[PDB]
């Protein structure tokens with residue numbers, strides 16, 4: 001018995017007793033079906049927020065955008081998703097335009113690095129350009 | 141042949157468990173083998189009157 | 190049926206697999222629940238198994 | 246409260262009396278109606294096999310109930326197990342037949 005792997009790895013006589021019955025007679029008021037569907041919906045686990053973390057080569061993952069702008073944009077996206085889930089054109093619960101002045105909110109993006117510097121040039125290219133200056137070549 | 145690596149076979153007055161792990165690994169030892177089993181979480185739900 | 194969890198088995202020759210969960214060595218599930226007042230067993234399998242034949 | 250301890254190696258199953266003790270499936274018992282209603286299927290499987298032939302007698306406390314009469318002929322054989330089992334089978338957590 002080999003259990004298959006979930007994610008890719010590095011390499012890649014007898015008589016029927018008088019009590020038993022096989023016919024249902026009860027229908028649940030809080031329906032079994034209804035509850036299950038909601039439960040499996042709540043049971044869905046947390047969403048991964050991979051923004052800002054470095055990659056295998058060291059380049060930070062994400063999009064180049066201002067921090068507060070990214071926070072506002074994802075708040076708007078959350079409002080749109082709430083409206084879509086509520087299946088109404090206007091959402092009662094809004095995570096955006098709350099009315100509380102929240103202008104200091106910051107949310108992770110790809111603009112900043114772990115060294116607190118901009119990511120205009122991806123890190124791997126920065127290290128490559130630094131090392132290049134040092135190289136020397138065979139004598140003419 | 142490295143004698144100290146096969147310690148439990150050469151050294152006669154050596155208990156079958158002692159190992160000089162920090163200094164040199166010894167590639168002949170006693171291993172514990174066994175077979176458990178993991179049954180699924182079972183439960184019988186009963187209603188309170 | 191099984192006289193341990195009061196579960197009904199369609200084929201009596203498959204009672205061994207059921208009692209293996211209770212721990213009796215007679216001769217893929219993760220959770221098995223039984224309801225006292227109704228006949229509706231509920232079972233669990235991992236998120237990626239098969240056609241998902243009436244299993245959570 | 247009720248728990249059923251399955252009997253292994255030929256032992257008899259026991260149900261926990263509310264006083265704390267546990268007794269086998271024989272004797273004189275007293276059940277509230279709600280207790281059987283809430284655990285209809287579980288109780289029927291583990292009690293009918295002893296009620297029909299064993300030495301189990303149960304006094305289910307109701308207080309009031311409608312009844313339906315069946316008139317048989319004394320000169321001939323008569324068995325009521327079919328009706329008495331249909332009733333127990335048709336008992337539900339929210340209904341009881343006559």
Ligand SMILES: [Zn+2]
Nearest residue numbers: 191193194211
């Ligand atoms: Zn069982």
